[PDB]
Amino acid sequence: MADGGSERADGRIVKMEVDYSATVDQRLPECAKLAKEGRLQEVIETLLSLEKQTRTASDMVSTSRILVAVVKMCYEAKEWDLLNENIMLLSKRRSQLKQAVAKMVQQCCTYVEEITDLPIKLRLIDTLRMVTEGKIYVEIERARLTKTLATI
Amino acid sequence: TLMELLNQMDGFDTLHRVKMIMATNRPDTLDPALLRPGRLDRKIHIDLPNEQARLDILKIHAGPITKHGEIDYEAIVKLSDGFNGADLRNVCTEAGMFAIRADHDFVVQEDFMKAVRKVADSKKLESKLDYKPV
Amino acid sequence: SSAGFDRHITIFSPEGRLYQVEYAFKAINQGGLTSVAVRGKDCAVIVTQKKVPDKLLDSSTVTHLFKITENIGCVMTGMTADSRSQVQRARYEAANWKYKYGYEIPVDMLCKRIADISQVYTQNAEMRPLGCCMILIGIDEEQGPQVYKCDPAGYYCGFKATAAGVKQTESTSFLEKKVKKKFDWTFEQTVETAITCLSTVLSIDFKPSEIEVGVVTVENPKFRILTEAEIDAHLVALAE
Amino acid sequence: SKMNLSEEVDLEDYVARPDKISGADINSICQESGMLAVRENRYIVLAKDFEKAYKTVIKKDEQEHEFYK
Amino acid sequence: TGYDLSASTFSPDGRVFQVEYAMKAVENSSTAIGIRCKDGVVFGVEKLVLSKLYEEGSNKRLFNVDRHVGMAVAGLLADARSLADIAREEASNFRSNFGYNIPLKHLADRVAMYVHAYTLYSAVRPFGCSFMLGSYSVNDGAQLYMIDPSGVSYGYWGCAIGKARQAAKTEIEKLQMKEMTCRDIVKEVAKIIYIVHDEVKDKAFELELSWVGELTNGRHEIVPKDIREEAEKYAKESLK
Amino acid sequence: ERGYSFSLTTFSPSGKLVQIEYALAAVAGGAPSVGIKAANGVVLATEKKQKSILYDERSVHKVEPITKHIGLVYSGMGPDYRVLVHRARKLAQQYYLVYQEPIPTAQLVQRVASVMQEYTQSGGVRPFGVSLLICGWNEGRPYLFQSDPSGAYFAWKATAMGKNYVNGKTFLEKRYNEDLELEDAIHTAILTLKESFEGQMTEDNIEVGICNEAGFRRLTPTEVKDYLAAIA
Amino acid sequence: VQVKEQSILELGSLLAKTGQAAELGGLLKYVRPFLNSISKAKAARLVRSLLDLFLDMEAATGQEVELCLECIEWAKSEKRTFLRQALEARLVSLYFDTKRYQEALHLGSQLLRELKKMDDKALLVEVQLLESKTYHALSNLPKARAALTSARTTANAIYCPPKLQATLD
Ligand SMILES: [Mg+2]
């Protein structure tokens, strides 16, 4: 449920340093089962609006440290696999995918000033894989454009 | 009269925003030229309800029915094997018939299973219900 | 077309057909059931649901999983009469093997006997062709697990995993894309795939009571039937 | 040549399947794949839309009794 | 038509209109039902007196195969008699070769095969009968089997046969069956078989009652019917 | 049974055998295959396709040995083949029991054809639905005969059964000659095999055995694919 | 035993990848008597593979015109029809490389009697086309025209001339 998993994630964001990172990532697939619910078209998605945010706090800890090449490809590969592990096509196509990758490019905005050439273009090479087939896709793709512009 | 359709479907003058919906029971008795793609684009296959489908339609007709909080839809579906939506509708009708019997304005669950037995019994006269596509 | 009594007896059509046996294949379809079989790296498993419309109807008296020998399991489809009558044939010549040759019969060989027997049911023109289907599994020395399918037509062939019942085309479609993609097969691999293919073809999410699971594996060659406890263990196992 | 057609789709691979296809069937194929990827909410075609393509149009081809041969 | 003639010819869809006819042919007979409590099995049958037609007690369909083995025939009568002779002969062979009581499973299975034998040729037709199989043991308990014209046979906790069949089994499942004593279940069925056949159809019928189980010491015998007469006193209070 | 005994095969008013005529049709509708006898032995190659990728190939077999120097293949319906296969198995055995020596090939074609012909004239049983091909290097010179549903048989330098046996027939008439060797005859046999085969022809798309004067032998998929080089 | 015989294919593949001709030309002759130890099928694969990898690379006539005649006469000693009949068609294509004035023209009198006498539908187009080369390059327009047309009508029976199509075009 949206509100329940929200108040739960509120206490789970504390466990970034309190609990081990990859243990928190083992705490991910439960919320990924919340994505396995697909209860309501917007209620079940607000969860993935949340745990993608907690995922970006894990990014703000492991990417804030050297855990960058390990933090990214382990993630975009499981969003890729998210079409098979959870409900296919991110279980609602959007609102938990749209702001998911949109907060991903918010992250990339936060790291373009920080993440050096190799890790920044491994991040870019992770999201451009989404540029091939799967990204925002409503009426913009300008998270795609806004970063592919930065690629030069 | 049919070849007029074959012409004015594809023919010379193309069409725009003109959608053709066809309905039949056995496709095997149709003209292949009419059956080729372009004229008849997609063939949608309708089949009998599964268990969950039967439960769902049963809930559908079961809505506006003065009854008791006693309905075991699951058992009725369990005895429910291969029945059209109109068939289950027939079940809801017959159960109400048994209710009119003895003039109990409510509905008991057992009349459901009885009507299911009757209707299911009535299908000892329907053979060759399937037809190969095309 | 109809010519003489090709529509009635086991004779040739003008096209070279014979309508009786092909009438017989869909004669299995009235059983209202679909079976599934799979072979693994060191194990093979059978599984098929049941329909218990009666509370008065017993539970243990519904099984189609038929133990032929201590190392031979089989499952049936079609009509219960032809199935059961098939059973005593299988058991019977099975024992006759041990009496004549000492050692244990090959599962392939027994399929040879059954297909040959069924051959005459079509061959003579004064005998009903026993419209049911046959499924066998068993471990082989220097060969591992094996699965075979006997038909009323009177032929057989090996496999790697196969289903039957009513959903042959669908289950085969699922299994072909399922296995050929370089699949490593463990025990719970083959099992979980077995439950999954059926539960997808039928879209059930069954309770652990309705279905049945036969099993043989090269750690205990005894043909084994599953208990609903462990069956539920695997059910929740695939239930992430 | 009209559709985007992502370069991971091998055309000849489906060409080998003889299948006795008519010319209009091809157009139905590319249509089915295209509306398939669109149903995926995608503006680019992949090979899966073609696997599904023959699994839709080329479907209804197999009924045989092995003992005939 | 054109295909339902033989017993060795498949319909163009895959069945046999011979057995098709014979089943409903049995369907037209009166009702005979059976049940089993926790420590026995009870048989009930409705018979029809036409006007006078016989010295009462004649031609009872409640047969008796073994000292512990009870029949419940329905449909045609004479073929049922032939079947009962087949069963008695069979159990005699089993006792002869092996020296103890035949298990109900093996007995019903053998009889089922023998029934299946008459569905594969043109020389003979199928049977026009059906029946029940009641047995009880101290090492086995209460077991009740059922046989169709086609050859299917297995167990129940209760079952019904005759015209009033589906309506009959309806209230049958209404009863608890696990903990019930067969003595109570006797007077119980009396309400069942006395809320069925009425006027403007047939005439004054007849209620016979077989009874085997623990209290019978495994021996099969008819209920003491005039004795204790609670079927009627209990099979009437349903006036409203 | 009852003992009806009445044959179901009668002569036409024109004077023809309708049932045999029909069985020849189903024989023609069988899988194609061919064999050749060239100056050292005989080679037999079939048209074996698995309808699905889930089949096993090392399970079912087509080129079948009878004795160490006698091979046989068929074209028709699979199931009826195995029966007469076993029959010939025994029938070759009793000869060896009588005389203590490997039965000559022509004797087998005699007795088998007798069994099939008598089985045709018998009552209440359709004839078989398969033609056969037999080869064996009995006393140096190998031999290659063909049976048929009518029980007849011939002696072919090389021929083919199945579909398009007339097209591959002519192809054999042209590409074939008086004498060759085993490998070359294999090359032409796979030539006509590809003459009507499917697209991909692998070790499992066909199967081939041979007779030599050293005895009968079967070919494995190893040397099959190994010979697949220089296709046709 | 076998790992070495496949190793001739390996090292020959090295001689063909690194780009040298004489080094392989010795490798061919080094394994001529070694051939007499394995099946005629694997021998077929070996001779075809080595000869084609040797021919397709270099325009060094110091060894090709000799070794090709080697494999041809050895085909005489082994009695294979298709082997010699293919290596001949390769041979005449080798002859055209030096603008051979008559032996490039004897392919008809030496091979066309066999090709059209056989059933072949693939090699006859090639021989007719190359013969269309030999007369145009040797100043004969009408004969090359008629032969080209014969290859045209012959090309109407191949289901897959994927490269021979443009070769004819
Ligand atoms: Mg038109």
Phi and psi at C65, nearest 5°, equal -65, 110
Give the amino acid at C82.
D
Q: Of E143, E61, E139, E141, which is closest to residue E107 (Cα–Cα)?
A: E143
Enter the DSSP assignment of G108.
I
| CA B11 / ligand 1 centre spacing (Å) | 4
Give the position of tokens 């029946």: E131
E204 within 8 A of E60, measured Cβ to Cβ:
no
Nearest CA to A75 out of A34, A113, A129 is that of A129
Query: What amino acid occupies position F70?
Result: I
Task: Please identify which residue in the block is written with the tokens 């019917």.
Answer: E225
CA separation for the pair A55, A61 (Å, rounded): 10
Q: Rounded to an integer, what distance in angstroms lies between the CA atom of residue C238 and that of residue C231?
A: 11
Q: Do E13 and B127 touch (CB under 8 A)?
A: yes
Tell if the CB–CB gap between D46 and A133 is shorter than 8 Å: yes
- Distance CA(A31)–CA(A86), nearest Å, equals 10
Q: How far apart are CA E64 and CA E72, in angstroms?
A: 9
Which of C9, C24, C84 is nearest residue E14 as measured by Cβ atoms?
A: C24
Phi, psi at E130, each rounded to 5°: -150, 170
d(CA E229, CA F70): 84
**Angstrom distance (rounded) from CA C20 to CA C131:** 10
For residue B29, the 8-state DSSP code is: G
User: Which residues of B touch chain D, with CB atoms under 8 Å apart?
Assistant: 36-38, 41-42, 133-134
Which among E128, E129, E91 has a CA at the least distance from the CA of E108? E91
Chain D: give the shortest CA distance to residue A86, in Å. Answer: 16
How far is it, in rounded angstroms, from Cα G56 to Cα B50?
Answer: 64
Beta bridge partners of F210: F43, F217
Which chains would you list as touching G if contact means 3+ CB atom pairs under 8 Å? F
Residue C79 and residue C30 in contact, taking contact as beta carbons nearer than 8 Å: yes
**Is the CB of residue C235 less than 8 Å from the CB of residue C208?**
yes
| H or E element that contains E79 | helix E78-98
| Among C215, C218, C204, C221, residue whose Cα is nearest residue C235 | C204
Burial environment of residue A66 by CB neighbours within 10 A (0 to 12, 13 to 18, 19 or more): exposed
Helices first, then strands: H and E counts in chain G = 10, 0
B121: which chain E residues are within 8 Å (Cβ-Cβ)? 166
> What's the B7 CA to ligand 1 centre distance in angstroms?
6
| Cα E29 from chain centre | 12
- Residue of A124, A103, A89 lying closest to A54 (CA atoms): A103
C158 touches chain F (CB under 8 A): yes
**Surface of E (104-123) touching C: CB under 8 A:** 109, 112-113, 116, 119-122
Residue F129 contacts D where some CB pair is shorter than 8 Å: no
> Cα torsion for C209, C210, C216, C222, to the nearest 10°?
60
Q: What is the radius of gyration, based on Cα positions, of chain B?
A: 21
Provide the domain count of chain E.
1
If you measure from the C-alpha of residue B35 to the centroid of ligand 1, how many angstroms do you get, rounded to a whole number? 13
- Backbone phi and psi for residue C149, each to the nearest 5 degrees, phi listed first: -130, 115
Contact at 8 Å (CB) between F228 and F203?
yes
Which residue of chain C has the CA closest to B50? C202
| Residue that has been written with the tokens 């087998």 in this structure | F108
Q: What angle do helix axes G22-30 and G2-17 make, rounded to 10 degrees?
A: 160
Beta bridge mates, E43: E34, E210
CB C108 within 8 A of CB F59: yes
**CATH classification of the domain holding E6:** 3.60.20.10
Beta bridge partners of F160: F34
Rounded CA-CA distance B40/B37 in Å is 5
Asked if G45 reaches chain F (Cβ–Cβ under 8 Å), the answer is: yes
Q: How far is Cα G58 from Cα G21, in angstroms, rounded to an integer?
A: 6
Give the residue from F232, F185, F218 showing the smallest Cα distance to F37. Answer: F185
Kind plus residue range of the DSSP H or E element containing E34: strand E32-37
Q: Do chains D and F touch (3 or more CB pairs under 8 A)?
A: yes
Using the Cβ of E170 and the Cβ atoms of chain B, whether some distance falls under 8 Å is answered with yes
Q: Which of F170, F181, F226 sits opposite G45 (nearest CB)?
A: F226
In this structure, are residues A88 and A47 in contact, taking their beta carbons and an 8 Å threshold?
A: no
DSSP C171-195: HHHHHHHHHTTT----HHHHHHHHH
Q: Are E35 and E143 in contact (CB under 8 A)?
A: no
Task: Say how far apart CA C156 and CA C165 lie, in whole Å.
Answer: 16
Contact F37, F179 (CB under 8 A): no
What is d(CA B56, CA B50) in angstroms, rounded to the nearest whole number?
A: 10
Tokens for C207? 């309770």
* Helix, strand, coil tally for chain C in percent (to 5): 40, 20, 40
Of C155, C169, C173, the CB nearest to D67: C155
Q: Are D52 and D36 in contact (CB under 8 A)?
A: yes
Of C127, C136, C132, C124, nearest to C82 (Cα)?
Answer: C132
In a mutagenesis test of the C interface, which of B78, B127, B129 is the best target, namely the one with the most C β-carbons within 10 Å?
Answer: B78
Q: How many CB atoms lie within 10 A of CB C6?
A: 19
Q: What is the distance between the alpha carbons of residues G67 and G87, in angstroms, rounded to a whole number?
A: 11
Enumerate the residues of chain F whose CB falls inside 8 A of the CB of residue G118. 174-175
Q: Which residues of chain D does A133 touch, with a Cβ-Cβ cutoff of 8 Å? A: 6, 42, 44, 46
Number of H helices, E strands in chain A: 10, 0
Residues of chain E found within 8 Å of residue C57, distances taken between Cβ atoms: 154-157
Distance from the first to the final alpha carbon of chain C: 54
Give the three-state DSSP class for G37.
Answer: coil
Q: How far apart are the first and last CA of chain A?
A: 42
* Alpha-carbon dihedral D3, D5, D11, D14, rounded to 10 degrees: -80
Q: Tell me the backbone φ, ψ of residue A122, rounded to 5 degrees.
A: -75, -35
- Nearest Cα of chain D lies from the Cα of B133 at a distance, in angstroms, of 8
Q: In a 3-state reduction of DSSP, which class is residue E64?
A: strand
- Contact between F207 and F63 under an 8 Å Cβ cutoff? The reply is yes
CA-to-CA dists, residue C131 to C36, E148, E204, angstroms: 19, 18, 45
| Whole-number Å distance between alpha carbons of A112 and A129 | 18
Contact assessment for residue F171 and residue F195, using Cβ atoms and an 8 Å cutoff = yes
Taking the centre of ligand 1 as the mean of its atom positions, its distance from the CA of residue D49, in whole angstroms, is 27
Ligand 1 center–CA B15 separation, angstroms: 12
Q: What is the DSSP string of F23-88?
A: HHHHHHTS--EEEEE-SS-EEEEE----SSTTS-SSSS--SEEEETTEEEEEEE-HHHHHHHHHHH
Q: Which candidate, C131, C130, C126, C89, places its Cα nearest to that of C111?
A: C89
At C67, list the tokens.
Answer: 């133990």
**Strand, coil or helix: E145:** strand
Distances (CA, A) of C109 to C158, F51, F59: 12, 23, 11
Query: Which domains are delineated in chain F?
Result: 1-232 (3.60.20.10)
**Spatial separation of the C-alpha atoms in residues F67 and E80, rounded to whole Å:** 56
**What angle separates helix A28-37 from helix A43-62, to the nearest 10 degrees?**
160
What is the separation of C-alpha E184 from the centre of its chain, rounded to a whole number of angstroms?
A: 20
Asked if residues C72 and C28 have their Cβ atoms less than 8 Å apart, the reply is no
Contacts of C49 (CB under 8 A, 6+ apart): C33, C34, C198, C202, C204, C206, C210, C211, C212
Residue G146: Cβ within 10 Å count: 13
E18 CB near a chain C CB, below 8 Å?
no
> Which of E156, E7, E85, E71 is closest to C81 using CA atoms?
E7
Q: Residue D58 Cα, ligand 1 centroid: separation in angstroms?
A: 22
Tokens at C116, concatenated = 């040959």
Taking Cα atoms as reference points, which of G39, C81, F34, F4 lies closest to residue E16? Answer: C81
Nearest CB to G40 within list F170, F180, F183: F183
d(CA F218, CA F35): 14
Q: Under DSSP, is residue C8 helix (H, G, I), strand (E, B) or coil?
A: coil
- B101 has binding-site annotation: no
For residue E123, which residues of chain F lie inside 8 Å, CB to CB? Answer: 1-2
Helix, strand, or coil here: C105? coil
What domain range includes position E157? 1-240
* Residue E138 DSSP symbol: S
Min Cα distance C196 → chain E (Å) is: 30
Report CA torsion sign: F169, F174, F178, F183. Answer: negative
Q: Which member of C154, C169, C173 has the closest CB to residue D67? A: C154
Other chains touching B, judged by 3 or more CB pairs under 8 Å: C, D, E
Beta-carbon count within 10 A of B93 CB: 13
User: Which residue stretches of C102-186 are H helix?
Assistant: 107-123, 168-179
Taking the C-alpha atoms of residue G81 and residue E186, their distance in angstroms, rounded to an integer, is 94
* A75: CB partners within 8 A, 6+ apart: A55, A59, A126
Pairing of strands F130-136, F70-76: antiparallel
B50 is in an annotated binding site: no
DSSP state of A90: G
Name the experiment that determined this structure: cryo-EM
Question: Which are the residues after which chain C is interrupted (C to N > 2.5 Å)?
Answer: none
Sheet order of strands, F33-37 included: F158-161, F33-37, F42-46, F208-212, F215-218
Kindly give, in sequence order, each residue whose CB lies less than 8 Å from that of residue B56, ignoring residues fewer than 6 positions away: B49
Whether C21 and D65 lie within 8 Å, measured CB to CB: yes
Distance B10 CA to ligand 1 centre (A): 5
Contacts of B57 (CB under 8 A, 6+ apart): B49, B85, B88
Find the radius of gyration of the CA atoms of chain G.
Answer: 17
Q: Give strand pairing partners of E106.
A: none
Task: Tell me if B56 sits within 8 A of B85, measured CB to CB.
Answer: no
User: Which secondary-structure segment (H or E) carries C46?
Assistant: strand C43-48
Check whether B117 is labelled as a binding-site residue. Answer: no
Q: Which residues pair with E44 in a beta bridge?
A: E33, E209
CA of B6 to the centre of ligand 1 (A): 7
A130 and A122 Cβ atoms separated by less than 8 Å? no
Residue B36 labeled ligand binder = yes
For residue E48, give the H/E element and its range.
strand E40-48
- Residue of chain E whose Cα is closest to the Cα of F2: E123
Phi, psi at F77, each rounded to 5°? -100, 130
Inform me whether the C-beta atom of residue F2 falls under 8 Å from chain C C-beta atoms: yes
Strand order in the sheet with E205-213: E158-161, E32-37, E40-48, E205-213, E221-222
Q: How far is D32 from chain B (nearest CA, A)?
A: 9
Query: What does the alpha-carbon distance between residue E227 and residue E225 come to, in Å, rounded to a whole number?
Result: 5
Crossing angle (nearest 10°) for helices B85-100 and B109-122: 130
User: Is there a contact between C71 and C139 (Cβ–Cβ < 8 Å)?
Assistant: yes
C-alpha angle G70-G43-G2 in degrees, rounded to nearest 5:
130
Residues A102 and A143 sit within 8 Å (Cβ to Cβ): yes
Angle between helices G123-136 and G141-154 (to 10 degrees): 170
Helices C168-179 and C187-202: angle between axes, nearest 10 degrees: 140
Interchain pair E152, C58: CB under 8 A: no
Three-state DSSP at E216 gives coil
Closest chain E residue to B120, measured at CA:
E166
Query: Alpha-carbon distance E203 to E194, whole Å?
Result: 13
Burial of F12-36, coded b for 16+ CB within 10 Å and e otherwise, reads: eeeeebbbbebbbbbbbbbbbbbbb
CA–CA distance, A90 with A92 (Å, rounded to integer): 6
HSE of A15, CA atoms in CB hemisphere, 13 A:
17
Closest-CA residue to B41 (of D51, D38, D15, D30): D30
Contact (Cβ atoms closer than 8 angstroms) between residue G127 and residue G89: yes
> How far does the centroid of ligand 1 lie from the alpha carbon of residue D50, in Å?
26
* CA-based nearest residue in chain B for residue E24: B124
Distance CA G105, CA G95 (A): 10
C56 touches chain B (CB under 8 A): no
**F79 near C CB under 8 A:** yes
DSSP string, C202-234: HT----TTT-EEEEEETTEEEEEEPPHHHHHHH
Contact F77, D67 (CB under 8 A): yes
Instruction: Output phi, psi for A120, to 5 deg.
Output: -70, -35
Q: Which residues pair with C149 in a beta bridge?
A: C135
Annotated resolution, angstroms? 4.1
**F25 close contact with C: CB closer than 8 A:** yes
Max CA distance (Å), chain D: 47
* Residue E178 β-bridge partners: none
Q: DSSP secondary-structure letter at B28? A: G
Backbone angles phi, psi at A114, to 5 degrees: -115, -55
Helix G81-96 vs helix G123-136: angle between axes, to the nearest 10 degrees? 20
Ligand 1: centre distance to CA D16 (Å): 28
Burial class of residue E198 in the structure, from the number of CB atoms within 10 Å of its CB (0-12 exposed, 13-18 middle, 19+ buried): exposed
Separation between Cα atoms, residue E15 and residue E9, nearest integer Å: 9
